[PDB]
Design a protein around this ligand. Structure first.
Ligand SMILES: [Mg+2]
Ligand SMILES: [Mg+2]
Ligand SMILES: [Mg+2]
Ligand SMILES: [Mg+2]
Ligand SMILES: [Mg+2]
Ligand SMILES: [Mg+2]
Ligand SMILES: [Mg+2]
Ligand SMILES: [Mg+2]
Ligand SMILES: [Mg+2]
Ligand SMILES: [Mg+2]
Ligand SMILES: [Mg+2]
Ligand SMILES: [Mg+2]
Ligand SMILES: [Mg+2]
Ligand SMILES: [Mg+2]
Ligand SMILES: [Mg+2]
Ligand SMILES: [Mg+2]
Ligand SMILES: [Mg+2]
Ligand SMILES: [Mg+2]
Ligand SMILES: [Mg+2]
Ligand SMILES: [Mg+2]
Ligand SMILES: [Mg+2]
Ligand SMILES: [Mg+2]
Ligand SMILES: [Mg+2]
Ligand SMILES: [Mg+2]
Ligand SMILES: [Mg+2]
Ligand SMILES: [Mg+2]
Ligand SMILES: [Mg+2]
Ligand SMILES: [Mg+2]
Ligand SMILES: [Mg+2]
Ligand SMILES: [Mg+2]
Ligand SMILES: [Mg+2]
Ligand SMILES: [Mg+2]
Ligand SMILES: [Mg+2]
Ligand SMILES: [Mg+2]
Ligand SMILES: [Mg+2]
Ligand SMILES: [Mg+2]
Ligand SMILES: [Mg+2]
Ligand SMILES: [Mg+2]
Ligand SMILES: [Mg+2]
Ligand SMILES: [Mg+2]
Ligand SMILES: [Mg+2]
Ligand SMILES: [Mg+2]
Ligand SMILES: [Mg+2]
Ligand SMILES: [Mg+2]
Ligand SMILES: [Mg+2]
Ligand SMILES: [Mg+2]
Ligand SMILES: [Mg+2]
Ligand SMILES: [Mg+2]
Ligand SMILES: [Mg+2]
Ligand SMILES: [Mg+2]
Ligand SMILES: [Mg+2]
Ligand SMILES: [Mg+2]
Ligand SMILES: [Mg+2]
Ligand SMILES: [Mg+2]
Ligand SMILES: [Mg+2]
Ligand SMILES: [Mg+2]
Ligand SMILES: [Mg+2]
Ligand SMILES: [Mg+2]
Ligand SMILES: [Mg+2]
Ligand SMILES: [Mg+2]
Ligand SMILES: [Mg+2]
Ligand SMILES: [Mg+2]
Ligand SMILES: [Mg+2]
Ligand SMILES: [Mg+2]
Ligand SMILES: [Mg+2]
Ligand SMILES: [Mg+2]
Ligand SMILES: [Mg+2]
Ligand SMILES: [Mg+2]
Ligand SMILES: [Mg+2]
Ligand SMILES: [Mg+2]
Ligand SMILES: [Mg+2]
Ligand SMILES: [Mg+2]
Ligand SMILES: [Mg+2]
Ligand SMILES: [Mg+2]
Ligand SMILES: [Mg+2]
Ligand SMILES: [Mg+2]
Ligand SMILES: [Mg+2]
Ligand SMILES: [Mg+2]
Ligand SMILES: [Mg+2]
Ligand SMILES: [Mg+2]
Ligand SMILES: [Mg+2]
Ligand SMILES: [Mg+2]
Ligand SMILES: [Mg+2]
Lengths: 265, 132
RNA sequence: CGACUCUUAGCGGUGGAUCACUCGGCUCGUGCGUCGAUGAAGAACGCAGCUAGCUGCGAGAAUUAAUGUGAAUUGCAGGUUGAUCAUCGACACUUCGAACGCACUUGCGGCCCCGGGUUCCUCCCGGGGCUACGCCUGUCUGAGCGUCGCU
RNA sequence: CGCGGACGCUACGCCGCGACGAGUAGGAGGGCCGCUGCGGUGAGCCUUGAAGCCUAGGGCGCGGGCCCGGGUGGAGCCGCCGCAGGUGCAGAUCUUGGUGGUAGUAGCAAAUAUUCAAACGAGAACUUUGAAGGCCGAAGUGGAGAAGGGUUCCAUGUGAACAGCAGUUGAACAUGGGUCAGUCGGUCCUGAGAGAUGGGCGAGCGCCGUUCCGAAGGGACGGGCGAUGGCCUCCGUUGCC
RNA sequence: GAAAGACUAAUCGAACCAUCUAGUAGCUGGUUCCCUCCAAAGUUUCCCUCAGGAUAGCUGGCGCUCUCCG
RNA sequence: GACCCGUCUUGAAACACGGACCAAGGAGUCUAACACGUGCGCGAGUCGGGGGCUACGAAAGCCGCCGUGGCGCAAUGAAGGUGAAGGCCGGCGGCGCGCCGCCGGCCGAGGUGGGAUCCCGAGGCCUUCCAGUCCGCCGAGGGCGCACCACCGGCCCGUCUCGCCCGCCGCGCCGGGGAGGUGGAGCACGAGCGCACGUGUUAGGACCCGAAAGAUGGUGAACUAUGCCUGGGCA
RNA sequence: CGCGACCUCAGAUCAGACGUGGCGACCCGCUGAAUUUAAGCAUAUUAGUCAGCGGAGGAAAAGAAACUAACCAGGAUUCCCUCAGUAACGGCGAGUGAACAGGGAAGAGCCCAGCGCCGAAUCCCCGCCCCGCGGCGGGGCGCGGGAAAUGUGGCGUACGGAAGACCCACUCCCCGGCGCCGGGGGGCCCAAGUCCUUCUGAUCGAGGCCCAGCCCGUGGACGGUGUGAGGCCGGUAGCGGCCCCCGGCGCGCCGGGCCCGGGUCUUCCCGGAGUCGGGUUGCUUGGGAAUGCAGCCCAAAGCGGGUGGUAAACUCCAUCUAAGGCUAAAUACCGGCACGAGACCGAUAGUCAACAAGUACCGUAAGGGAAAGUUGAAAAGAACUUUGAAGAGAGAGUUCAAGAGGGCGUGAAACCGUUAAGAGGUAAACGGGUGGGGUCCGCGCAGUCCGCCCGGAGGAUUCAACCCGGCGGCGCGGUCCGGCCGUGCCGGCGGGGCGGAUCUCCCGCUCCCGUCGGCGGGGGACCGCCCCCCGGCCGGCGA
């Protein structure tokens, strides 16, 4: 507030009186009568730079970088190494772009959709969520940030036929929509590779929403995909190729250590 | 999760409406579960407690399989007093021991006209959801 | 062999830092947007069986009626035809205060009307009702050779 | 014929050769140094004992600092890749608290003065009674009041607090008690002066002003009418003229 | 104010209380963790300028075109 | 061996100042703008910041006949205003072969000096002595020559000097054209826009503490200063 | 000197009505400074700002043109982006600083006076009765009384209007007392383990329940309970249920009210006055030979008047009607009651204040204004004995714990007390270097291990090789048959979608003497890219 520290009335005692030329409290017969009122170093009194509300809180980022981050977060939810190293339990899942039929939008019982994540062998992740329900450290306990947990697998559908009431209870499971995708729940924390469970009617829509290189997006205005910068990224099948190992000089890998000086006399 | 936006999920606005709650809601907060003997017959799960009921004790130091009787409810400390749960001071007088009512199972009730109106409604609007 | 003085450790004192908690505050946001001459805001004095304080109320004074709930309140004594806790729509609301009979000592009165010592006849006590300034439409009563003319 | 050949290379890595190194104000870079908090993650640790303190215990780092064992303690905490900040103290006659030296010292010296015996008592250089010896010496260290204070006045108990030593004593504490009017005073009149209405100014809350630019008499008086009733005799009580 | 610049709630060669207010200062004091590398000036012109700032100088940082003729 | 630490100072152990002692708290922060470095996307274009449409979520996603608008692509003059090569060739006009001028065929966006890389490639790189393919190499000299720097020319606007021809619904104080020096923040085959971080200068309380004063609006004559009313006292 | 009447004007404790003071976050009207900046300072700036004064509301003000622009022209006010830190002002120094157009939120418009016509066609109050009446109203009656010709009502207002003709058209409109059909506040109500062995002072913790993975899961947010809980209680979820109350709006009638409109032609009428404007003085604004406002004197006009950003005359065009009025939404909100959340602070912080805080306490006053959180799960808050006049002790006793004792969690340093050790004449303290003495660790006190051969003794369920069964890898097979793909392609009788500043018979309108012709709503073909089934080349199959 603007009133911190200034709802007193003070004036220094001047020189003499063996004091420090500080604003002091105008008289009275109590304890707080000549104690030190204004300034920052006093008991009571204001802080340094009373923080104002018009600090620039928000930021904006361009459009075509928001869409480049979505294409660069979808392209790494397909490798079984950037998902295992993120931390999930994906040792047994039979196919990484996991596409399931359109009759999951007709589920309405979470009892009917655990038998689904058991058949899909994804329950050991939810088991890791039950094995990681713990508290929080610090002053978050008195600000309604009590219990934390660990982010689980995502689920992407096409249309809402009843699935939300049948998944929103299992902790970890984060729902989406293709038409209204999000990054903050695809890249948790700033890191890449959250496990995802696609549906058929959506995974057959990304070709229309984002478009190939020789065909633009038809539900956007004007947008093609970005261009790579180099193709054969694997320089282990480049360098030991017959076109390059021939046109080099000899490799000089002999160590040539310093010699001691002996006296020639 | 809760979706109603006029109900507070805070900690302090739930501790305050508990330590400064009036007596006619202290009535509802101080209830206790019924035994599986009564749960079989009435098809009920919990009732508020009255001065002249019958009680076993499940948890605490004095737990066992004994049937005591309620002496007097003390709804200022959210606590009651039972017949034979007492202990000795220095000189020898017996002082009762406070037990919170959630640790307490009921085996017999104190039935009235104002109690069977309730108990037949907490199974009428119990079965409507069964009719789902 | 001591005493004093300095040094470090163990124990004990003075002191209330640190750690951990929180019925409090700060900022933003939503919906509403309501006082008083039918006596407001504010202040003063009173009220509990044992009571000082804040808090709750107004000679019906830590609350009455009604409805809703349906067995306690509590530091100690007491004594289901509805206790106690809530809501509040029917009753009541002491003295100052824009303050209103004239004053600020709570002091001096007046006009009606009932009860009593009495026997409207004056005074005598008690009880109730009225007696502020400013202005509006009306009713009543009046002034004016400056009006203005008739009778 | 035989089925045999070390280490390495987190490429922001590893290895080798040369010359050099001072440094205030000031500039830059690296910080696996550190504090409080948020997104992520460690199938982390924790009442078979977490934070925090203590330590003649054992060690590492150039250093900032961290880690371990041994004691107390009793319920929540840390590491890594990233984000944000009210983020690191010896001083400012710094601010708020708290304790020493000086110190058992300065000091308890204005107005002439105290002794003896007894009683209650755990206890008496001061308390009460008596016995002397002295002072104020009628413009008093005496008897009563106004201004001010507000329960100090009175009694019975208390002794941990206060009465700058003590205390059986107290203007201290705790329980209770107390202030009686036709004649004493307030009330009632005016004084120097304050202050409304009519009226004047003034953007305005309001201001000058007090007989001055005002239709300022609400009352008695004597007589006549209409009224009423009081034992309507004698009259009251009202209205008008 | 029978006058001295006296007194006006311990305050007078213009009282006290709150607000604009955290008033201005070329002027005094203080300015909070480690290591590594480089390293100075107190001279110039102009200023109601001489306790001060502008300017050139000295210094550090980031790079660049070539060499591996000047 | 060795004076006590902080601080202004040409010069501190100083007979210069602040400092008795311990714990906690304590001083370059926050917006707007601009300049330059640096990281990212799109690219002669870029940007939806304001507006709309569909618990975390007050978030995210879209809209192109919602791209209006901002900066940029084009400068100069006080302004009215103007607004960025030309070479060669045909028959050709007068005159004095040349200019200028009405018409046709081709051509064409400069020049010299340095210039990293590039190309041609005289000559040879053995293993019993002579032919000969490829692969690069080596390589004297010789060629195209990026980026840039210096210089010469040319073009555009403003302004002065010398002087000639052409145009026309309006025939004039009309309009247009050339050569030569001078002024310009300009062209000469683009380089910007939006976001995030860093230092630096500034405007705001602006590294924190510090004055002597200045103004508006209000409270006091219970002490003391003087006039008044009413009473009281001086062997 | 009379009775009389309109006018001007008083009094009343006359009847019935009204306003006055407070809050002051946002608002409208006036009044209005100085610190400060310019390196001084006086015009400027600080500022139409604080303070001061008067008025309201749930929102206030503004407002249907005496308007902008010179275009092929827009068309009430407010509000956001933009123009713009720009045209301009200014010791032309420091510095201040607008609007129009364009895209958007919201969208709503109107009435009187005058001019004239209808026989005051007009209100308010008193009286009686009936209905309803916790917002005092309607209909019937009043030889019952009052105001208005110094003008009450109807039509009617600048988009033109009225009137009288002649033609064309008319069948709903508004409330008020009700009956009746299906947004809001309060109340009470709604899932599932205290299952096994065990740790503990007490479990919510550790483990277990498979071949339905303990149970419900449209409910795993949170809170209470003797540490930590989806399943112990309360609670959350759900177009879940029930019980009350007040409305919004729909339909039946029963009542009263109001008889109204077009088009086409003839004749009439038509607007606000000490104000506009002019001179002047003073404040002001970006407004500059003077934008607005205010004061003094002068003071108008009807083919008129003001404006048309440089003063002045003569001219032409354009656009508007001053001096009188009303009006919802879009916008603002540190106060107020009622609510949710938070990359915030966590008792010297955060509001001054977590607690008997604007309280104690100082000053005559105006005014100034603090310090102060925490036993334990439960007071089970220490019976009794004993010394002492008592305070305070000594044993005992409660709890897991007095090493938690009524200002009681944790218990830091300065500082003091006592114990143990080691010392002591140049104030103590430090640095470099050893030496001695102590505390401690070595869980030291007969000190390596791993490979490989020779030798010594032992024992297995024991090797090499073949035989079947299963998996996996390379395949240059100099080239096994199949596959999909191509930021690879050629031709096609293909079967199709997006675009286009490439081209031109139909629908329509306007124009033309059913015909032309500009303008378009449409076809249809021509291209380019993309998709799609059949056909061919090369190709990888190490994203
Ligand atoms: Mg504070
Ligand atoms: Mg912590
Ligand atoms: Mg709900
Ligand atoms: Mg009492
Ligand atoms: Mg009742
Ligand atoms: Mg008096
Ligand atoms: Mg060095
Ligand atoms: Mg030590
Ligand atoms: Mg605890
Ligand atoms: Mg310190
Ligand atoms: Mg002495
Ligand atoms: Mg004497
Ligand atoms: Mg006396
Ligand atoms: Mg006396
Ligand atoms: Mg006494
Ligand atoms: Mg008297
Ligand atoms: Mg006066
Ligand atoms: Mg005198
Ligand atoms: Mg003098
Ligand atoms: Mg002065
Ligand atoms: Mg400051
Ligand atoms: Mg100051
Ligand atoms: Mg350098
Ligand atoms: Mg000069
Ligand atoms: Mg100076
Ligand atoms: Mg300087
Ligand atoms: Mg020496
Ligand atoms: Mg100094
Ligand atoms: Mg100096
Ligand atoms: Mg000197
Ligand atoms: Mg120096
Ligand atoms: Mg020094
Ligand atoms: Mg000095
Ligand atoms: Mg000193
Ligand atoms: Mg600190
Ligand atoms: Mg840049
Ligand atoms: Mg600069
Ligand atoms: Mg600064
Ligand atoms: Mg001055
Ligand atoms: Mg006096
Ligand atoms: Mg005098
Ligand atoms: Mg009256
Ligand atoms: Mg002024
Ligand atoms: Mg100045
Ligand atoms: Mg200055
Ligand atoms: Mg000055
Ligand atoms: Mg201004
Ligand atoms: Mg001014
Ligand atoms: Mg002003
Ligand atoms: Mg103001
Ligand atoms: Mg008012
Ligand atoms: Mg109101
Ligand atoms: Mg309005
Ligand atoms: Mg209006
Ligand atoms: Mg108009
Ligand atoms: Mg306009
Ligand atoms: Mg601009
Ligand atoms: Mg100048
Ligand atoms: Mg506009
Ligand atoms: Mg709209
Ligand atoms: Mg009308
Ligand atoms: Mg009219
Ligand atoms: Mg339940
Ligand atoms: Mg719990
Ligand atoms: Mg605990
Ligand atoms: Mg729980
Ligand atoms: Mg469980
Ligand atoms: Mg001005
Ligand atoms: Mg005016
Ligand atoms: Mg002009
Ligand atoms: Mg003209
Ligand atoms: Mg008007
Ligand atoms: Mg929310
Ligand atoms: Mg913080
Ligand atoms: Mg504190
Ligand atoms: Mg505090
Ligand atoms: Mg603390
Ligand atoms: Mg405390
Ligand atoms: Mg505590
Ligand atoms: Mg313990
Ligand atoms: Mg303690
Ligand atoms: Mg000791
Ligand atoms: Mg010793």
């Amino acid at each position: 507030s603007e009133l911190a520290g200034h709802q007193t009335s003070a004036e220094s005692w001047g020189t003499g009186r063996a004091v420090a030329r500080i604003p002091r409290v105008r008289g009275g017969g109590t304890h707080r009568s000549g104690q030190g009122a204004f300034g920052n170093m006093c008991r009571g009194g204001r802080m340094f730079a009373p923080t104002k509300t018009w600090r620039r809180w928000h930021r904006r980022v361009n459009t075509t970088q928001k869409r480049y981050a979505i294409c660069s977060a979808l392209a790494a939810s397909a490798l079984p190494a950037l998902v295992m190293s993120k931390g999930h339990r994906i040792e047994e899942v039979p196919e990484l772009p996991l596409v399931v039929e359109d009759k999951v939008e007709g589920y309405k019982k979470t009892k009917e959709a655990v038998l689904l994540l058991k058949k899909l062998k994804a329950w050991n992740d939810i088991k890791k969520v039950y094995a990681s329900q713990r508290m929080r450290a610090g002053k978050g306990k008195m600000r309604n940030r009590r219990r934390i947990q660990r982010r689980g697998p995502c689920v992407i559908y096409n249309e809402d036929n009843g699935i939300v009431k049948a998944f929103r209870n299992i902790p970890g499971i984060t729902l989406l929509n293709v038409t209204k995708l999000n990054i903050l729940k695809l890249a948790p924390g700033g890191h890449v590779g959250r496990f995802c469970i696609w549906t058929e009617s959506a995974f057959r829509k990304l070709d229309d929403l984002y478009g190939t290189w020789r065909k633009a997006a038809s539900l956007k205005s004007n947008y093609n995909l970005p261009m790579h910068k180099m193709l054969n990224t694997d320089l282990s099948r480049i360098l030991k190729s017959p076109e390059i190992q021939r046109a080099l000089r000899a490799p000089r890998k002999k160590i040539h250590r310093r010699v001691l000086k002996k006296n020639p006399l | 999760m809760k979706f109603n936006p006029f109900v507070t999920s805070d900690r302090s606005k739930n501790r305050k409406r508990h330590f400064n709650a009036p007596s006619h809601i202290r009535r509802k907060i101080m209830s206790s579960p019924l035994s599986k003997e009564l749960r079989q017959k009435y098809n009920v799960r919990s009732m508020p407690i009255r001065k002249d009921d019958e009680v076993q004790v499940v948890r605490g130091h004095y737990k066992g399989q004994q049937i005591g009787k309620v002496v007097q409810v003390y709804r200022k400390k959210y606590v009651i007093y039972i017949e034979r749960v007492q202990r000795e001071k220095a000189n020898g007088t017996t002082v009762h021991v406070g037990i919170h009512p959630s640790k307490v199972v009921i085996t017999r009730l104190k039935l009235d006209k104002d109690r069977k109106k309730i108990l037949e409604r907490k199974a009428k609007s119990r079965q409507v959801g069964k009719e789902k």
